[PDB]
Ligand binder design. Structure first.
Ligand SMILES: [K+]
Ligand SMILES: [K+]
Ligand SMILES: [K+]
Ligand SMILES: [K+]
Ligand SMILES: [Mg+2]
Ligand SMILES: [Mg+2]
Ligand SMILES: [Mg+2]
Ligand SMILES: [Mg+2]
Ligand SMILES: [Mg+2]
Ligand SMILES: [Mg+2]
Ligand SMILES: [Mg+2]
Ligand SMILES: [Mg+2]
Ligand SMILES: [Mg+2]
Lengths: 75, 102
RNA sequence: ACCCACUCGGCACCUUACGAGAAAUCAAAGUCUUUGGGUUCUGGGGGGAGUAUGGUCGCAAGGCUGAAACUUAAAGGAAUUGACGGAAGGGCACCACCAGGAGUGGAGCCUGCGGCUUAAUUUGACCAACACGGGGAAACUCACCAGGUCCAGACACAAUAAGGAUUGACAGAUUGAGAGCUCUUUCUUGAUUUUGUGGGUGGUGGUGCAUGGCCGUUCUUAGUUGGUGGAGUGAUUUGUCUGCUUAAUUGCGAUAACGAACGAGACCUUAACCUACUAAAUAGUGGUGCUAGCAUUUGCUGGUUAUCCACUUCUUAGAGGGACUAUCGGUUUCAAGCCGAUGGAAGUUUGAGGCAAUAACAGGUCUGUGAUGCCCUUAGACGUUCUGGGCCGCACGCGCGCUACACUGACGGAGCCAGCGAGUCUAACCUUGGCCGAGAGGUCUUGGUAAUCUUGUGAAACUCCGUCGUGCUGGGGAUAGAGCAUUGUAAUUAUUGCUCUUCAACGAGGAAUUCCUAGUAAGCGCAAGUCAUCAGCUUGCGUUGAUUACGUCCCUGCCCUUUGUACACAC
RNA sequence: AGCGCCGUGACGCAGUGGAAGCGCGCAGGGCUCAUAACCCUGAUGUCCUCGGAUCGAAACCGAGCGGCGCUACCA
RNA sequence: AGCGCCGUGACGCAGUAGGAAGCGCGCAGGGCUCAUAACCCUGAUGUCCUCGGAUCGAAACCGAGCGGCGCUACCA
RNA sequence: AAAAAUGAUUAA
């Protein structure tokens, strides 16, 4: 059984790589002059989400990251 | 073996498609044979007259000697057996055997 | 003229070679490496070639004499084994024929193959391929085509590596898609990994002409081998055989062979026979012993191992018995044996199987195998999964088959009969029965882990009684239209079932060709295998049950022996 | 220069104004392991073109094309 | 010398009365085969000898050249 | 005493 070569009619698509940002201590916690701190991130309602869940921010929605939940800011 | 060319294969396929049906037999047909299934007066008189002196009486001989269908043969035969001018010998479906009375 | 004994010469024979020879063979072809009686002629691998040229003879035909160039690794002799023979002899087979039966080849359809077509229409196989791969493929299967994912890239080295090495992601483009596959902004885990170099793991990739194992075939026949001895320089041969006999290299026997082995036989399973043992509400029968329902001077059924008891005939399985061609009549190298009859259940090894030698095929299978060498491939994979399609595609050719051409029938009503099976608790299998539905089916329970229930698989062919009436007819049921259901996520390219409608070729089939000898052919169905659904297939089972022949070598082949061969890749 | 003839199936050739035939060749099936032979069956033509007469031409008429021929003597 | 002709892949042959080329060999690659040969499939190969003209358009028509074919070539 | 032709190359 002689076989041909698999010629491709489409461009190769790239496997995704995790984006490299050196901002992982900057945009999560803030320090007051006295030193008092309250996290600006919100908390997942489900108990199995974690206290340091750090709900993300989008243009129009909030993303969990662990529990994959969606909320709104003007609730 | 020897592969035929594409033109030869097409010619053979086209010849086979164009080919007529070669029936390998002599087809002989007999002519139309009709039997009066409806019993009119003249045929009934012929029945009542010549059915006696018949040595052998059956659906087939009634059909052959009289142009009546098998259905009329069966019903008329049973009618004659009711009138008793024929007596039975062997009683069976699909085959009747009858002769003269007394 | 015969006989006997001799003798010389001659044509030759038979036995054995002591001798010779490569052997076949040879009383010379002996007296030869232990080489010498005398003498003439001829040859020096095979071809070119008894040719060219010259000479000579001949009327001619031609004869005699007679090279070279060139070309080539064998040509040749005798014998051995096999193979073959339109060679002989003897046996044998229904994959041969005779006498026949049933067919097939013609028709429609089913299925497999080829070819066309195709994006692919995946592929192997050409007596001993073609309902074969257990191959009846909607997904899978799948190996093919159009695309989309994932790594299931172990391990070693090194580089990255404090938000990294890496993932997963809801929403909006996007893709057939609710695959974050790619992106659009930013969240989760955290040395589990990413990258590259070695390596390894997979592959229904290739090669069965690299191989194993298995299977088929040679080959359904009776054939096969060594120990010692004999023959031969040897390859080899005898044993292992002329005759008779058997299915048989089966025996009787003959015998430079003797004793042995495998195969055949013997052996094992299975259908038969057992009024004999063992027994059995999971097989039965009987006592009607208990009540009774019906008819009536006595039969048929219902409840019977707690509503009891007896017995194994029917049934089953344990141990056995039984047939050994027994007896008899014939026939024989009177031996192996064979032909009749009588008994017996059984007298073609009683029937049918299972197993089945040495040697081989470049037979088939790498697509059964975590059987496998080597080659190839390995991240945009020939890996593995997901969606869709294909494997089914049709001017055509072929091989298995199914249904038919009808009255020995079709249709309708009724009578009413098998054997082999199989079947759920890791979950829906075989289904009684009740109800609804024309049907296919649907619903509610029941029994069966099974001699208990489906199931007495109440099958069909069959038989009776009626309709048809020789008309391609009411035979046939192809094609096609419409609807109702079941399986399955998914039914269109129609899974299948059911109802109504359409109602084609087909009038017994040219040349040709297949299977078969008694419970066989053939007809008829049933079960099982594949199965969620799907039989026109296979493997079995029983039902009804012929004709013809107990033979021959004519055809096609097989075995043994003899023979010929310029064959051995073997006619 | 003048005159005559021929053109038909792949090939060689018949052919009566009512649509064309022999032999091979070819094709299908069979037999054979296979090919041939053999057996059983099929198919193949604006009759060189283009017009005309005829109801209808392969044939008759007119041209055009391509081949084959014949005469070519007295000087 | 005249009069007719002809020239088409590497090799032969088909055009036709102008709308761009077919076939057969050869070559190459596939299918079959242990591998070949034969066979089959596919592809490539012709600037129609060169030049010029007429034409919307020429391998087809016209002219020249080149090459080959055929016929003709005082006179008594 | 009917007829019966053929079978490409190489590969212990
Ligand atoms: K046969
Ligand atoms: K055989
Ligand atoms: K039949
Ligand atoms: K798939
Ligand atoms: Mg010599
Ligand atoms: Mg598939
Ligand atoms: Mg093999
Ligand atoms: Mg021997
Ligand atoms: Mg198939
Ligand atoms: Mg009808
Ligand atoms: Mg099958
Ligand atoms: Mg020969
Ligand atoms: Mg040969």
């Amino acid at each position: 059984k002689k076989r041909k070569k698999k010629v491709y009619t489409t461009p190769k698509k790239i496997k995704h790589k995790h984006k490299k940002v050196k901002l992982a201590v900057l945009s999560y916690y803030k320090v007051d002059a006295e030193g008092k701190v309250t996290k600006l991130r919100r908390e997942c309602s489900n108990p199995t989400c974690g206290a340091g869940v750090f709900l993300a921010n989008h243009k129009d929605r909030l993303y969990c990251g662990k529990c994959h939940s969606v909320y709104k800011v003007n609730a | 073996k020897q592969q035929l060319s594409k033109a030869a294969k097409a010619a053979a396929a086209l010849a086979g498609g164009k080919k007529s049906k070669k029936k390998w037999s002599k087809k002989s047909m007999k002519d139309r044979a009709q039997h009066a299934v409806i019993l009119d007066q003249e045929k009934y008189d012929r029945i009542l007259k010549e059915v006696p002196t018949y040595r052998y009486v059956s659906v087939s001989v009634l059909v052959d000697r009289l142009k009546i269908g098998g259905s009329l043969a069966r019903i008329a035969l049973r009618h004659l057996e009711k009138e008793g001018i024929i007596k039975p010998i062997s009683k069976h479906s699909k085959q009747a055997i009858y002769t003269r009375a007394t």
